[PDB]
Amino acid sequence: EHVIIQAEFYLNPDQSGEFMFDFDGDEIFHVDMAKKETVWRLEEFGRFASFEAQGALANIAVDKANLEIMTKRSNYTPITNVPPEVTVLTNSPVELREPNVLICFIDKFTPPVVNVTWLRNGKPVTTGVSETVFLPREDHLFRKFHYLPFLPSTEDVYDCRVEHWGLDEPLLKHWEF
Amino acid sequence: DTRPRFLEQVKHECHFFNGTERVRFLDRYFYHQEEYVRFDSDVGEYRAVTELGRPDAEYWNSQKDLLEQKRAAVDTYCRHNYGVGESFTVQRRVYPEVTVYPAKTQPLQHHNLLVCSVNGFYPGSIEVRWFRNGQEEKTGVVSTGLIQNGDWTFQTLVMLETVPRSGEVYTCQVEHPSLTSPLTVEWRA
Amino acid sequence: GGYRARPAKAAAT
Numbered sequence: 001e002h003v004i005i006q007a008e009f010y011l012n013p014d015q016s017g018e019f020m021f022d023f024d025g026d027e028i029f030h031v032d033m034a035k036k037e038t039v040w041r042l043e044e045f046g047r048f049a050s051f052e053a054q055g056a057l058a059n060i061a062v063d064k065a066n067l068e069i070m071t072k073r074s075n076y077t078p079i080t081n082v083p084p085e086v087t088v089l090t091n092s093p094v095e096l097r098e099p100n101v102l103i104c105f106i107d108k109f110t111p112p113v114v115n116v117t118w119l120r121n122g123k124p125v126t127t128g129v130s131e132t133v134f135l136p137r138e139d140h141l142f143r144k145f146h147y148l149p150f151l152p153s154t155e156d157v158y159d160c161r162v163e164h165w166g167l168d169e170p171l172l173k174h175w176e177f
Numbered sequence: 178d179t180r181p182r183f184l185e186q187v188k189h190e191c192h193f194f195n196g197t198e199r200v201r202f203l204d205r206y207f208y209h210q211e212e213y214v215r216f217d218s219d220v221g222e223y224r225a226v227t228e229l230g231r232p233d234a235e236y237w238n239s240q241k242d243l244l245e246q247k248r249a250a251v252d253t254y255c256r257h258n259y260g261v262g263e264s265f266t267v268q269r270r271v272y273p274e275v276t277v278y279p280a281k282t283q284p285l286q287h288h289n290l291l292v293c294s295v296n297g298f299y300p301g302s303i304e305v306r307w308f309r310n311g312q313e314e315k316t317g318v319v320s321t322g323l324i325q326n327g328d329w330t331f332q333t334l335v336m337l338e339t340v341p342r343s344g345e346v347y348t349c350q351v352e353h354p355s356l357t358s359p360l361t362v363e364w365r366a
Numbered sequence: 367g368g369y370r371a372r373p374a375k376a377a378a379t
Protein backbone atom coordinates (compact mmCIF):
# COMPACT_ATOMS: atom_id res chain seq x y z
CA GLU A 1 0.00 0.00 0.00
CA HIS A 2 2.66 2.64 0.88
CA VAL A 3 6.41 2.73 1.49
CA ILE A 4 8.41 5.40 3.29
CA ILE A 5 12.20 5.25 2.98
CA GLN A 6 14.78 7.33 4.81
CA ALA A 7 17.65 7.09 2.30
CA GLU A 8 21.22 8.19 3.05
CA PHE A 9 24.56 7.98 1.36
CA TYR A 10 28.15 9.12 1.72
CA LEU A 11 30.67 9.16 -1.12
CA ASN A 12 34.50 9.16 -1.12
CA PRO A 13 36.68 10.90 -2.17
CA ASP A 14 34.15 13.63 -2.99
CA GLN A 15 33.09 13.69 0.68
CA SER A 16 29.48 14.24 -0.32
CA GLY A 17 26.60 13.01 1.78
CA GLU A 18 22.84 13.15 1.52
CA PHE A 19 19.79 12.44 3.67
CA MET A 20 16.25 12.29 2.33
CA PHE A 21 12.81 10.80 2.95
CA ASP A 22 10.90 9.15 0.07
CA PHE A 23 7.17 8.36 -0.03
CA ASP A 24 6.08 5.98 -2.80
CA GLY A 25 9.01 7.20 -4.95
CA ASP A 26 8.60 10.96 -4.39
CA GLU A 27 10.87 13.06 -2.20
CA ILE A 28 9.26 14.37 0.99
CA PHE A 29 12.32 16.38 2.01
CA HIS A 30 16.07 16.39 2.14
CA VAL A 31 18.57 18.07 4.45
CA ASP A 32 20.86 20.72 2.98
CA MET A 33 24.09 19.63 4.66
CA ALA A 34 25.82 22.99 4.10
CA LYS A 35 23.01 25.15 5.51
CA LYS A 36 22.02 22.39 7.98
CA GLU A 37 18.41 22.98 6.94
CA THR A 38 15.43 20.81 6.12
CA VAL A 39 14.32 21.49 2.53
CA TRP A 40 10.77 20.43 1.70
CA ARG A 41 10.15 19.16 -1.82
CA LEU A 42 6.90 21.16 -1.95
CA GLU A 43 6.70 24.31 0.18
CA GLU A 44 3.28 23.31 1.54
CA PHE A 45 4.79 20.29 3.33
CA GLY A 46 6.74 22.57 5.70
CA ARG A 47 3.44 24.02 6.99
CA PHE A 48 2.24 20.57 8.11
CA ALA A 49 5.40 18.88 9.42
CA SER A 50 8.90 19.51 10.66
CA PHE A 51 12.24 17.77 10.92
CA GLU A 52 15.24 18.53 13.15
CA ALA A 53 18.10 18.59 10.64
CA GLN A 54 20.70 17.72 13.29
CA GLY A 55 19.68 14.06 13.29
CA ALA A 56 20.57 13.86 9.60
CA LEU A 57 23.96 15.40 10.27
CA ALA A 58 24.62 12.81 12.99
CA ASN A 59 23.71 9.89 10.69
CA ILE A 60 25.91 11.17 7.84
CA ALA A 61 28.89 11.23 10.22
CA VAL A 62 28.26 7.60 11.11
CA ASP A 63 27.86 6.85 7.39
CA LYS A 64 31.21 8.50 6.68
CA ALA A 65 32.91 6.44 9.39
CA ASN A 66 31.15 3.27 8.19
CA LEU A 67 32.29 3.86 4.60
CA GLU A 68 35.89 3.90 5.83
CA ILE A 69 35.33 0.57 7.59
CA MET A 70 33.57 -1.09 4.65
CA THR A 71 36.13 0.17 2.12
CA LYS A 72 38.78 -1.73 4.11
CA ARG A 73 36.63 -4.88 4.40
CA SER A 74 36.25 -4.87 0.59
CA ASN A 75 40.03 -4.51 0.16
CA TYR A 76 39.45 -1.05 -1.35
CA THR A 77 37.22 -2.43 -4.10
CA PRO A 78 35.85 0.69 -5.83
CA ILE A 79 32.44 1.28 -7.40
CA THR A 80 31.77 0.39 -11.02
CA ASN A 81 30.39 3.38 -12.93
CA VAL A 82 26.89 2.85 -14.33
CA PRO A 83 26.15 5.58 -16.90
CA PRO A 84 22.70 7.19 -16.86
CA GLU A 85 19.80 6.99 -19.23
CA VAL A 86 18.53 10.47 -20.05
CA THR A 87 15.07 11.57 -21.17
CA VAL A 88 13.84 15.09 -21.94
CA LEU A 89 10.11 15.81 -21.77
CA THR A 90 7.66 18.61 -21.07
CA ASN A 91 5.29 18.43 -18.15
CA SER A 92 2.28 19.47 -20.24
CA PRO A 93 1.26 19.42 -23.93
CA VAL A 94 3.16 22.12 -25.75
CA GLU A 95 1.42 25.18 -27.21
CA LEU A 96 3.23 28.12 -28.78
CA ARG A 97 3.68 31.08 -26.42
CA GLU A 98 2.10 29.04 -23.57
CA PRO A 99 4.53 28.76 -20.64
CA ASN A 100 5.68 25.18 -20.02
CA VAL A 101 8.51 23.29 -18.29
CA LEU A 102 11.21 21.11 -19.77
CA ILE A 103 12.05 18.10 -17.57
CA CYS A 104 15.42 16.36 -17.87
CA PHE A 105 15.18 12.90 -16.26
CA ILE A 106 18.52 11.28 -15.43
CA ASP A 107 18.03 7.67 -14.40
CA LYS A 108 19.73 4.39 -13.39
CA PHE A 109 23.22 5.73 -12.69
CA THR A 110 25.95 5.50 -10.09
CA PRO A 111 27.95 6.99 -8.40
CA PRO A 112 25.65 9.94 -7.48
CA VAL A 113 27.74 12.59 -9.23
CA VAL A 114 26.62 14.37 -12.39
CA ASN A 115 27.11 17.64 -14.27
CA VAL A 116 23.87 18.69 -15.99
CA THR A 117 23.62 21.70 -18.29
CA TRP A 118 20.58 23.06 -20.07
CA LEU A 119 21.33 24.40 -23.57
CA ARG A 120 19.17 26.82 -25.56
CA ASN A 121 20.36 26.97 -29.20
CA GLY A 122 23.67 25.54 -28.04
CA LYS A 123 24.29 27.99 -25.17
CA PRO A 124 24.09 27.26 -21.40
CA VAL A 125 20.97 28.60 -19.70
CA THR A 126 20.54 29.10 -15.95
CA THR A 127 17.79 31.62 -15.25
CA GLY A 128 14.80 29.74 -13.87
CA VAL A 129 16.40 26.29 -13.75
CA SER A 130 16.02 24.01 -10.75
CA GLU A 131 16.89 20.45 -9.80
CA THR A 132 16.36 17.68 -7.30
CA VAL A 133 18.95 15.96 -5.14
CA PHE A 134 19.86 12.39 -6.00
CA LEU A 135 16.86 10.13 -5.58
CA PRO A 136 17.07 6.42 -4.65
CA ARG A 137 16.02 3.49 -6.83
CA GLU A 138 15.00 0.00 -5.73
CA ASP A 139 18.08 -1.38 -7.48
CA HIS A 140 20.19 1.08 -5.42
CA LEU A 141 21.23 3.18 -8.39
CA PHE A 142 20.07 6.83 -8.48
CA ARG A 143 17.85 9.14 -10.45
CA LYS A 144 17.54 12.90 -10.67
CA PHE A 145 15.41 15.64 -12.24
CA HIS A 146 16.40 19.00 -13.71
CA TYR A 147 13.77 21.51 -14.83
CA LEU A 148 13.74 24.49 -17.19
CA PRO A 149 10.68 26.74 -17.47
CA PHE A 150 10.41 28.02 -21.01
CA LEU A 151 8.16 29.65 -23.56
CA PRO A 152 7.78 27.36 -26.59
CA SER A 153 8.78 29.05 -29.84
CA THR A 154 9.56 27.69 -33.29
CA GLU A 155 12.89 29.56 -33.02
CA ASP A 156 14.49 27.67 -30.10
CA VAL A 157 16.01 24.23 -29.74
CA TYR A 158 16.98 22.77 -26.38
CA ASP A 159 19.34 20.10 -25.11
CA CYS A 160 19.95 18.56 -21.72
CA ARG A 161 23.69 17.80 -21.48
CA VAL A 162 24.62 15.16 -18.89
CA GLU A 163 28.21 14.37 -17.87
CA HIS A 164 28.97 11.24 -15.85
CA TRP A 165 32.11 9.17 -15.27
CA GLY A 166 30.41 6.13 -16.83
CA LEU A 167 29.89 7.98 -20.13
CA ASP A 168 32.58 8.30 -22.80
CA GLU A 169 31.21 11.59 -24.18
CA PRO A 170 28.69 13.97 -22.64
CA LEU A 171 25.17 12.76 -23.39
CA LEU A 172 22.92 15.36 -25.08
CA LYS A 173 19.17 14.79 -25.21
CA HIS A 174 17.38 17.11 -27.61
CA TRP A 175 14.00 18.80 -27.59
CA GLU A 176 12.37 21.09 -30.13
CA PHE A 177 8.85 22.19 -31.00
CA ASP B 178 38.77 12.60 -12.46
CA THR B 179 39.74 8.94 -12.68
CA ARG B 180 40.06 8.57 -8.88
CA PRO B 181 38.16 5.48 -7.64
CA ARG B 182 34.90 6.19 -5.80
CA PHE B 183 33.49 4.44 -2.73
CA LEU B 184 29.86 4.61 -1.72
CA GLU B 185 27.97 3.82 1.47
CA GLN B 186 24.17 3.77 1.46
CA VAL B 187 21.63 3.19 4.21
CA LYS B 188 17.89 2.78 3.61
CA HIS B 189 15.53 2.64 6.60
CA GLU B 190 12.29 1.38 5.06
CA CYS B 191 8.73 1.29 6.42
CA HIS B 192 6.25 -0.85 4.45
CA PHE B 193 2.54 -0.24 5.18
CA PHE B 194 -0.32 -2.65 4.39
CA ASN B 195 -3.90 -1.46 5.02
CA GLY B 196 -2.99 1.84 6.63
CA THR B 197 -0.95 1.19 9.77
CA GLU B 198 -2.66 -2.14 10.60
CA ARG B 199 0.29 -4.12 9.16
CA VAL B 200 3.79 -2.64 9.16
CA ARG B 201 7.15 -4.09 8.15
CA PHE B 202 10.40 -2.29 8.91
CA LEU B 203 13.70 -2.93 7.13
CA ASP B 204 17.11 -1.52 8.14
CA ARG B 205 19.35 -1.94 5.10
CA TYR B 206 23.08 -1.14 4.65
CA PHE B 207 24.81 -1.03 1.23
CA TYR B 208 28.37 -0.80 -0.12
CA HIS B 209 28.12 0.65 -3.65
CA GLN B 210 24.97 -1.28 -4.78
CA GLU B 211 25.49 -4.33 -2.55
CA GLU B 212 23.23 -4.84 0.44
CA TYR B 213 25.52 -6.48 2.99
CA VAL B 214 23.47 -6.47 6.21
CA ARG B 215 19.79 -6.01 7.01
CA PHE B 216 17.38 -5.91 9.96
CA ASP B 217 13.94 -7.28 9.06
CA SER B 218 11.19 -6.69 11.63
CA ASP B 219 9.77 -10.05 10.44
CA VAL B 220 12.86 -11.62 12.06
CA GLY B 221 13.89 -9.16 14.78
CA GLU B 222 17.65 -9.59 14.33
CA TYR B 223 20.23 -8.40 11.83
CA ARG B 224 21.26 -10.93 9.17
CA ALA B 225 24.29 -10.80 6.91
CA VAL B 226 23.15 -10.54 3.30
CA THR B 227 26.69 -11.01 2.00
CA GLU B 228 29.90 -12.04 3.74
CA LEU B 229 30.90 -8.37 3.87
CA GLY B 230 28.15 -7.87 6.45
CA ARG B 231 28.91 -10.78 8.79
CA PRO B 232 30.96 -8.62 11.23
CA ASP B 233 28.07 -6.18 11.62
CA ALA B 234 25.43 -8.90 12.02
CA GLU B 235 27.39 -10.44 14.89
CA TYR B 236 28.39 -7.15 16.50
CA TRP B 237 24.96 -5.51 16.26
CA ASN B 238 23.00 -8.59 17.41
CA SER B 239 25.13 -8.60 20.55
CA GLN B 240 23.69 -5.16 21.48
CA LYS B 241 20.37 -6.16 23.00
CA ASP B 242 19.42 -2.51 23.52
CA LEU B 243 20.00 -1.90 19.81
CA LEU B 244 17.86 -4.88 18.81
CA GLU B 245 15.10 -3.60 21.08
CA GLN B 246 15.21 -0.14 19.48
CA LYS B 247 14.91 -1.82 16.07
CA ARG B 248 12.16 -4.19 17.25
CA ALA B 249 10.08 -1.20 18.31
CA ALA B 250 10.71 0.83 15.14
CA VAL B 251 7.44 -0.33 13.49
CA ASP B 252 5.71 1.74 16.19
CA THR B 253 8.08 4.52 17.20
CA TYR B 254 9.38 5.17 13.67
CA CYS B 255 7.14 3.74 10.92
CA ARG B 256 3.75 4.38 12.54
CA HIS B 257 4.88 7.75 13.88
CA ASN B 258 6.23 9.06 10.57
CA TYR B 259 3.21 7.79 8.64
CA GLY B 260 1.02 9.83 10.98
CA VAL B 261 3.14 12.96 10.60
CA GLY B 262 2.74 13.15 6.82
CA GLU B 263 -0.62 11.45 6.25
CA SER B 264 -2.50 14.60 5.26
CA PHE B 265 -0.17 15.54 2.36
CA THR B 266 1.07 12.10 1.23
CA VAL B 267 -1.46 9.27 1.83
CA GLN B 268 -4.36 11.68 1.36
CA ARG B 269 -2.81 13.67 -1.50
CA ARG B 270 -5.22 13.77 -4.48
CA VAL B 271 -4.57 15.81 -7.66
CA TYR B 272 -6.95 15.67 -10.62
CA PRO B 273 -5.79 14.49 -14.06
CA GLU B 274 -5.97 17.15 -16.75
CA VAL B 275 -6.83 15.36 -20.00
CA THR B 276 -5.93 16.66 -23.47
CA VAL B 277 -6.69 14.92 -26.78
CA TYR B 278 -4.88 15.99 -29.96
CA PRO B 279 -3.94 14.26 -33.24
CA ALA B 280 -0.37 13.45 -34.26
CA LYS B 281 1.53 11.60 -37.00
CA THR B 282 3.66 8.46 -37.04
CA GLN B 283 5.45 9.74 -40.17
CA PRO B 284 5.88 13.44 -41.05
CA LEU B 285 4.37 14.43 -44.43
CA GLN B 286 1.75 11.66 -44.04
CA HIS B 287 -1.69 12.29 -42.52
CA HIS B 288 -2.93 12.25 -38.93
CA ASN B 289 -2.90 8.63 -37.80
CA LEU B 290 -2.26 9.01 -34.05
CA LEU B 291 -4.76 10.23 -31.46
CA VAL B 292 -2.89 11.23 -28.30
CA CYS B 293 -4.66 11.21 -24.93
CA SER B 294 -2.39 13.29 -22.73
CA VAL B 295 -3.14 12.83 -19.03
CA ASN B 296 -1.14 15.30 -16.97
CA GLY B 297 -0.52 16.50 -13.44
CA PHE B 298 -2.20 13.76 -11.42
CA TYR B 299 -1.49 12.07 -8.05
CA PRO B 300 -1.27 9.24 -7.07
CA GLY B 301 0.07 7.17 -9.97
CA SER B 302 -2.50 4.43 -10.39
CA ILE B 303 -4.51 5.31 -13.50
CA GLU B 304 -6.46 3.54 -16.23
CA VAL B 305 -6.78 5.15 -19.67
CA ARG B 306 -8.99 3.60 -22.36
CA TRP B 307 -9.85 4.58 -25.94
CA PHE B 308 -13.32 4.45 -27.51
CA ARG B 309 -14.57 4.98 -31.05
CA ASN B 310 -18.32 5.56 -31.37
CA GLY B 311 -18.88 4.12 -27.92
CA GLN B 312 -16.84 0.98 -28.65
CA GLU B 313 -13.61 0.26 -26.80
CA GLU B 314 -10.53 0.17 -29.06
CA LYS B 315 -8.05 -2.38 -27.72
CA THR B 316 -5.86 -2.55 -30.84
CA GLY B 317 -3.21 -0.05 -31.84
CA VAL B 318 -2.81 1.34 -28.31
CA VAL B 319 0.68 2.41 -27.28
CA SER B 320 1.74 4.51 -24.31
CA THR B 321 4.63 6.20 -22.63
CA GLY B 322 3.74 4.24 -19.51
CA LEU B 323 3.44 6.01 -16.17
CA ILE B 324 5.81 8.99 -15.97
CA GLN B 325 6.88 10.48 -12.64
CA ASN B 326 7.57 14.19 -13.03
CA GLY B 327 9.57 14.31 -9.81
CA ASP B 328 7.33 16.98 -8.29
CA TRP B 329 4.53 14.83 -6.80
CA THR B 330 2.66 14.68 -10.09
CA PHE B 331 2.55 12.05 -12.81
CA GLN B 332 1.71 12.09 -16.48
CA THR B 333 1.09 9.58 -19.22
CA LEU B 334 0.38 9.75 -22.96
CA VAL B 335 -1.89 7.02 -24.29
CA MET B 336 -2.02 6.94 -28.08
CA LEU B 337 -4.44 5.25 -30.47
CA GLU B 338 -3.14 4.21 -33.91
CA THR B 339 -6.11 4.90 -36.16
CA VAL B 340 -7.03 6.59 -39.43
CA PRO B 341 -9.77 9.06 -38.41
CA ARG B 342 -12.83 9.22 -40.66
CA SER B 343 -15.44 11.96 -40.76
CA GLY B 344 -18.37 11.41 -38.43
CA GLU B 345 -16.28 9.23 -36.10
CA VAL B 346 -16.21 10.42 -32.49
CA TYR B 347 -13.30 9.19 -30.35
CA THR B 348 -13.40 9.12 -26.55
CA CYS B 349 -10.49 8.99 -24.13
CA GLN B 350 -11.71 7.64 -20.78
CA VAL B 351 -9.64 8.20 -17.62
CA GLU B 352 -10.23 6.44 -14.29
CA HIS B 353 -8.23 7.58 -11.27
CA PRO B 354 -8.61 7.42 -7.46
CA SER B 355 -9.14 11.19 -7.30
CA LEU B 356 -12.30 10.84 -9.45
CA THR B 357 -15.75 9.60 -8.41
CA SER B 358 -16.76 8.60 -11.97
CA PRO B 359 -14.78 8.03 -15.20
CA LEU B 360 -13.61 11.19 -16.93
CA THR B 361 -14.16 11.31 -20.71
CA VAL B 362 -12.90 13.69 -23.41
CA GLU B 363 -14.23 13.48 -26.97
CA TRP B 364 -12.45 14.18 -30.23
CA ARG B 365 -14.21 14.40 -33.60
CA ALA B 366 -12.60 14.31 -37.04
CA GLY C 367 4.18 16.80 13.88
CA GLY C 368 7.90 16.05 13.58
CA TYR C 369 9.51 13.37 11.44
CA ARG C 370 11.74 11.12 13.56
CA ALA C 371 15.09 9.84 11.99
CA ARG C 372 15.98 6.27 12.43
CA PRO C 373 19.64 6.40 13.78
CA ALA C 374 22.55 4.88 11.85
CA LYS C 375 24.68 2.31 13.63
CA ALA C 376 28.47 2.31 13.83
CA ALA C 377 29.98 -0.63 11.97
CA ALA C 378 32.18 -3.20 13.66
CA THR C 379 35.90 -2.55 13.46
Ligand SMILES: *[C@@H]1O[C@H](CO)[C@@H](O)[C@H](O)[C@H]1NC(C)=O
Pocket residue numbers: 073074075229
Ligand atom coordinates in the same frame (compact mmCIF):
# COMPACT_ATOMS: atom_id res chain seq x y z
C1 LIG D 1 39.92 -9.22 1.31
O1 LIG D 1 41.18 -9.89 1.29
C2 LIG D 1 41.34 -10.90 2.31
C3 LIG D 1 42.75 -11.44 2.15
O2 LIG D 1 42.94 -12.02 0.86
C4 LIG D 1 40.27 -11.97 2.15
O3 LIG D 1 40.34 -12.89 3.24
C5 LIG D 1 38.89 -11.32 2.12
O4 LIG D 1 37.89 -12.31 1.88
C6 LIG D 1 38.82 -10.25 1.03
N1 LIG D 1 37.53 -9.59 1.05
C7 LIG D 1 36.77 -9.42 -0.04
C8 LIG D 1 35.43 -8.79 0.19
O5 LIG D 1 37.16 -9.74 -1.16
Ligand SMILES: *[C@@H]1O[C@H](CO)[C@@H](O)[C@H](O)[C@H]1NC(C)=O
Pocket residue numbers: 113114115163164165178
Ligand atom coordinates in the same frame (compact mmCIF):
# COMPACT_ATOMS: atom_id res chain seq x y z
C1 LIG E 1 31.96 18.02 -13.29
O1 LIG E 1 32.74 19.14 -13.71
C2 LIG E 1 33.93 19.35 -12.94
C3 LIG E 1 34.53 20.64 -13.46
O2 LIG E 1 34.53 20.65 -14.88
C4 LIG E 1 34.86 18.15 -13.09
O3 LIG E 1 36.02 18.29 -12.26
C5 LIG E 1 34.10 16.88 -12.72
O4 LIG E 1 34.91 15.73 -12.97
C6 LIG E 1 32.81 16.77 -13.53
N1 LIG E 1 32.02 15.64 -13.06
C7 LIG E 1 31.57 14.70 -13.88
C8 LIG E 1 30.78 13.60 -13.23
O5 LIG E 1 31.79 14.72 -15.09
